[PDB]
């Protein structure tokens, strides 16, 4: 349940970045940009965290 909840939160964040990039690209109306992107599409236990992890003391 909670894992799907975290998955949905991550999905919201990723959709935010994707839609930002989508609007930025949709503003661009130059034909050279669209031609180049068309050519491109057609081409294709841990030490640390807890306490002092070192040689002298742990």
């Amino acid at each position: 349940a909670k894992m799907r909840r975290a998955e949905l939160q991550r999905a919201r964040a990723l959709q935010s970045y994707y839609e930002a990039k989508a609007r930025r690209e949709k503003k661009i109306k130059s034909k050279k940009y669209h031609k180049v992107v068309k050519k491109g599409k057609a081409k294709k236990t841990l030490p640390g965290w807890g306490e002092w992890g070192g040689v002298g003391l742990k």
């Binding site: 130059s30 034909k31 050279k32 031609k35 180049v36 050519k39």
Partner: peptide
């Protein structure tokens, strides 16, 4: 020679009396 897509070329802005 014909320049390629990588070559930077900007689209031009179009702006008597009868008696």
């Amino acid at each position: 020679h014909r320049p390629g897509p990588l070559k930077q070329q900007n689209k031009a802005h179009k702006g008597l009396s009868r008696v």
